[PDB]
Amino acid sequence: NCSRDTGDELMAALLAEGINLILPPRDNIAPGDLIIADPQGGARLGGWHEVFNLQLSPEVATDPGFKSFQFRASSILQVGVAASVMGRVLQALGLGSGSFSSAFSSSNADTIQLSIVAPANKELTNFDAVLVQMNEAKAEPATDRNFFVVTKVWRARGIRISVADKSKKQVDLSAKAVEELTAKAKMELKREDTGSYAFLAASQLIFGLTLREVTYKDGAIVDVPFAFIGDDAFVDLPES
Secondary structure (H helix, E strand, C coil): CCCCCCCHHHHHHHHHHCCCCEEEEEECCCCCCEECCCCCEEEEEEHHCEEEEECCCCCEECCCCCECCCCCCCCEEEEEHHHHHHHHHHHHCCCHHHHHHHHHCCCCCCEEEEEECEEEEEEECCCHHHHHHHHHHHCCCCCCCEEEEEEEEEEEEEEEEEEEECCCEEECHHHHHHHHHHHHHCCCECCCCCEEEEEEEEEEEEEEEEEEEEECCCCEEEEEECCCCCCCCEECCCCC
């Protein structure tokens, strides 16, 4: 569980953009998509037809393409936290927390410095007009759930780390660690000439969403301005 009140430079940069980190990373979420969340449970992608008896979604407008965006921030993570974080992010690409714990322990690592490689975003440009269209449909309500519209999709090529021992000396991953990670990984593991390691997909994957909360009140859809789901900076978000 990664608290959003953590004092972490990259975490603060992500939250300044309203980013809800979603799990697993993926390729199939668009601006305007709907998330349905249980305030006392989980969240998932859903459809407006689960909230209203309609057929069509509103017409969404987006940026023509993704726009590059650099965070200029890194996270400094104690190795046990780093294994949990990286394992949660990369489990669907073959690398869970136990693999990272084994790798870091074999490497005499104490802290990991983590940054995001080649981030970009794509925005929903017509949020208010989406709500106008919904309210012009006059659809019947299909109740204690929360509803979020995706207003920005964030993608990245992967994660870069620097490994340090207890004296804050930068060190390589052990050969055992590299072999364990490379055997399981469904992505590229590259040692950079600076001594950092990059964990890279072949193209940019969606890792985060900016959200706006909406609610249904007295016969209208109303905006509740970044919104955040639950109590964990990471949101486990099954596909619809």
